[PDB]
Every structure is written in C-alpha cells, then in structure tokens.
Amino acid sequence: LYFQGADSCIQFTRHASDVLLNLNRLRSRDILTDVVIVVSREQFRAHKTVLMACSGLFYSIFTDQLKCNLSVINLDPEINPEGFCILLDFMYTSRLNLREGNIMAVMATAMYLQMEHVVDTCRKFIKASE
Ligand SMILES: O=c1[nH]c2ccc(Nc3ccc([N+](=O)[O-])cc3Cl)cc2[nH]1
Numbered sequence: 001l002y003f004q005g006a007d008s009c010i011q012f013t014r015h016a017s018d019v020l021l022n023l024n025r026l027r028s029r030d031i032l033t034d035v036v037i038v039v040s041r042e043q044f045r046a047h048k049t050v051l052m053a054c055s056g057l058f059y060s061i062f063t064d065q066l067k068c069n070l071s072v073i074n075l076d077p078e079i080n081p082e083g084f085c086i087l088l089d090f091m092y093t094s095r096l097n098l099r100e101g102n103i104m105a106v107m108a109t110a111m112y113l114q115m116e117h118v119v120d121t122c123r124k125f126i127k128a129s130e
C-alpha cells in the first residue's frame with residue numbers, strides 16, 4: 001500500500017497507523033515505557049513522547065527542564081481514570097470511544113490534558129444531543 005504523494009514522493013498509506021499499532025504493542029508489553037501517570041490511585045504506564053505528541057499538558061511537563069526527568073506524574077485527583085484511559089487509548093489508536101455515559105468525563109479530561117481537537121469533537125456531539 002503505497003502511492004505517489006502530492007509532491008511526487010512515495011508515501012506509504014498504512015505507515016503512520018502501523019507505527020501507532022506497534023507503539024501500542026510496546027505499551028501493552030511494557031517495553032520502553034518511561035513514565036507512570038497516576039489518576040486517583042490508578043497507575044497507567046506510557047511513553048512520554050506519545051503523550052507529548054497528543055497533549056498540550058504533557059508537552060509542557062516534558063519540555064520543562066525540572067519535570068522532564070520525573071518517572072511518575074500525578075494528575076488532578078478529580079480526573080476520572082475511565083476518562084483518562086479513553087484518551088490514552090485514543091492517543092495510541094486514533095479511536096475515541098465516546099458514549100453518552102462517558103462524554104462529560106471525557107470532555108473534562110481532554111480539557112485538562114489540552115487536547116483541543118477532542119474537546120471540540122465532544123462539544124459537537126453534546127450540541128447534537130440537545
Ligand atoms: O519489517 C519489519 N520487521 C519488524 C519487526 C518488529 C517491528 N516492531 C514490533 C514488533 C512487535 C512488537 N510487539 O511488541 O508485539 C512491537 C514492535 Cl514495535 C516492526 C517490524 N517491521
């Protein structure tokens with residue numbers, strides 16, 4: 001699966017999603033994970049680079065000279081770990097499992113994590129269901 005990209009260069013259709021699939025496999029097997037995120041006493045292991053690529057909050061934390069070395073990051077204990085987990089899975093898969101029963105928590109968490117495209121999407125779905 002390749003094509004001639006808009007600039008004559010060969011582009012591989014599945015490459016970016018295959019990279020994510022493989023990063024998610026690393027996460028599942030706890031390979032090269034370098035941070036644990038703590039969400040009201042639940043722990044989630046991840047790769048800092050993936051977090052920074054997806055979240056303004058994590059980008060700010062891991063580019064700070066003081067905080068970039070921390071191996072444990074605590075989030076606001078009001079954050080819903082289901083909400084966090086939905087967003088973490090999204091980061092590693094492109095799939096956002098929004099449901100009526102989780103949308104408010106997911107939106108609040110995405111606001112906290114500075115994930116603007118997700119916040120906007122949640123807003124659109126809320127506005128439609130009114
Ligand atoms: O042509 C090739 N040969 C490859 C061999 C390995 C990988 N990467 C990989 C495999 C398995 C898991 N895993 O943990 O299941 C995680 C990763 Cl990152 C990619 C390849 N492309």
Ligand SMILES: [K+]
Nearest residue numbers: 040077078079
């Ligand atoms: K909580």
